[PDB]
Amino acid sequence: EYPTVNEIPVGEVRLYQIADGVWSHIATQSFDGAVYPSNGLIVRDGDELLLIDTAWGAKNTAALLAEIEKQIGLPVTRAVSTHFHDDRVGGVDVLRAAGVATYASPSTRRLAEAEGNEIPTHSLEGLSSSGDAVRFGPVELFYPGAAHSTDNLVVYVPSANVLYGGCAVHELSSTSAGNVADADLAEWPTSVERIQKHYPEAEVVIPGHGLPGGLDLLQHTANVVKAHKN
Ligand SMILES: Cc1ccc(-c2cccc(S(N)(=O)=O)c2-c2nn[nH]n2)cc1
Ligand SMILES: [Zn+2]
Ligand SMILES: [Zn+2]
């Protein structure tokens, strides 16, 4: 029942319950003339919500806030963007205007600035070295090393054993490494192996685009990246 790309018009946002106090958000957006689905995460933080990633653009992110208000009814107080591309930061200005404090690593903020993308307000120190982990409310943020991008972070929800891989992790049906313009194909399998080693108890793995599954998404991603390489 997870929503697919052809089931969500561009501009609409769906929420999907992953575990108690954990949802994914699903949106669609047009990029270089093709439409893609994209996931983010919502994690309950007492009587507040932590958001992971925007819904890929200003209009989608406004729709995301409206869907959260309707379905959950708890305020989003903080957001983390997991890398500098528009499917993660596009909509940060909408969040910042709505009273959401926006965060990203200094690596993500520098790359977003250089690219002309929206820039989260606050900088997340303690994530500059591969294998670094920091606590942020109900989640752990982990920097696995360069993969889809040099700044990509992954997010673990310890209470639910949910691993949100962002664009460093591909869905099982994926046949390509996607947009590799900013990727490190050689380090990506090593970065996946660091994720596998650090989160062996993950029950749900959510990719940046497409269907959640289990731990197999990690190995599949290393395989996809190898097939792209040659
Ligand atoms: C199979 C597939 C998945 C996603 C995309 C995609 C489409 C638009 C924008 C991006 S991003 N985050 O700007 O680089 C991506 C992407 N590629 N890999 N991760 N995200 C393309 C193909
Ligand atoms: Zn990306
Ligand atoms: Zn992506």
Side-chain angles (χ1 to χ4, degrees), residues 1-200 202-230:
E1 297 290 314
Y2 200 83
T4 70
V5 63
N6 60 339
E7 298 173 339
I8 310 170
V10 175
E12 290 192 12
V13 173
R14 308 284 190 260
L15 307 181
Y16 182 90
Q17 189 91 250
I18 295 285
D20 296 20
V22 185
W23 298 257
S24 63
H25 62 82
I26 314 89
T28 58
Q29 186 57 269
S30 175
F31 179 82
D32 291 10
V35 173
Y36 299 88
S38 188
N39 301 315
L41 206 69
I42 302 163
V43 187
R44 189 174 57 227
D45 183 20
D47 61 358
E48 302 172 14
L49 302 176
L50 173 62
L51 182 60
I52 309 300
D53 291 325
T54 66
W56 197 352
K59 279 171 141 210
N60 284 355
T61 298
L64 167 66
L65 294 178
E67 195 65 17
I68 287 172
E69 184 41 47
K70 174 176 133 140
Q71 264 186 106
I72 308 168
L74 296 170
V76 174
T77 54
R78 298 185 290 188
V80 173
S81 292
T82 63
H83 71 280
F84 74 100
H85 293 155
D86 202 48
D87 56 333
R88 309 295 136 200
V89 301
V92 151
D93 295 346
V94 163
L95 297 176
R96 180 182 81 250
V100 179
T102 60
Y103 293 80
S105 73
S107 180
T108 295
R109 297 180 77 258
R110 289 190 307 264
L111 294 164
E113 185 182 359
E115 196 81 18
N117 293 350
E118 296 158 63
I119 311 166
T121 296
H122 304 286
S123 300
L124 296 170
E125 301 300 323
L127 290 164
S128 66
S129 186
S130 59
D132 278 340
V134 304
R135 290 204 184 183
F136 196 83
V139 305
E140 181 167 71
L141 306 179
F142 182 70
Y143 175 53
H148 166 72
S149 65
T150 63
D151 60 323
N152 50 204
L153 301 179
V154 307
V155 179
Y156 195 68
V157 188
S159 72
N161 289 141
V162 172
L163 177 61
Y164 172 75
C167 304
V169 176
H170 270 102
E171 73 174 319
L172 294 174
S173 67
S174 187
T175 59
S176 92
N179 170 31
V180 300
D182 296 321
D184 185 335
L185 307 157
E187 189 61 22
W188 200 329
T190 298
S191 299
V192 165
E193 183 46 63
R194 291 192 183 94
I195 301 165
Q196 292 169 313
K197 175 179 182 183
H198 207 80
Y199 299 114
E203 290 180 17
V204 176
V205 176
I206 301 163
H209 306 270
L211 308 184
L215 276 168
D216 277 16
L217 274 70
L218 305 175
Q219 187 61 45
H220 178 67
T221 297
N223 300 166
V224 156
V225 168
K226 285 216 188 53
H228 172 95
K229 261 149 81 70
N230 57 270

